[PDB]
Amino acid sequence: AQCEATVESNDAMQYNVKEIVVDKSCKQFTMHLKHVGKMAKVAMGHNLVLTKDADKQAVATDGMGAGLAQDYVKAGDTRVIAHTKVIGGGESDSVTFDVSKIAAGENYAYFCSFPGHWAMMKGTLKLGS
Template identity: 30%
Template sequence: MKKYVHAFLAIACLSATTLRAEDAAAVELELKPHATNPLGYDKTELTVKKGVKVKLTLNNTGSAAPQPHNFILCKVGKLDAVGALANLMMTDVNGMAKGYIPENKEDILAHTMLVQIGQKETIEFTAPAEAGDYPYLCSFPGHWLLMRGVMHVTE
């Protein structure tokens, strides 16, 4: 019996000290268009811990040249691949209705829809489980080449 009590206590202690993604505090982030650069975000680097819940708001206000924007978080090393898909959206007659979000989402981890001038959208997602540098971009036609950044996911 004593053996079972010790085993139970050991398991209870281990499970109590394990930090699960759902136990981690949520991180709230806000991105806006850059105040003086119409094709840039106000933050080109964001940092979160792996597995944390992220609440990201894209607030499309305050830009020097107001235009619609979105936010797409890509897998590591997939900025150019997602950007190429964004370029193809320019010829899609339904591109605006689709928010200029590529149909092939294989390399996309999270995204907002197209946020109109003066509007904002909040999305919630879990940060990747692996540490790394995850690129993000705006896929509105012509924007992704300049309107981009990196989400650093750390241990």
């Protein structure tokens, strides 16, 4: 609703939403992440990272080497448009980004960069109205 969406992540390594559509009327957009499971962040942590589809694996790979304290996102990664921190069960986080950083027709991927999670936790985001 509005210029925001909510994605729930669980203990089975899956997002509940696979597609997010950003309305052209939005200048800013907010992504809310809820970890609805009950596992600790050191075992089942989840975040939400947004990049072009092409940068997915490169960003996830560098992110794994950043560490948990860095939310598994390489500090100042120029390929990451937006990202939340890594959360454990019972928690949540939000990230707001400038819609101008998004282009029509372009393909964007949101995925979890916690080690090994990217291959199963990913979705598509695009500008469309």
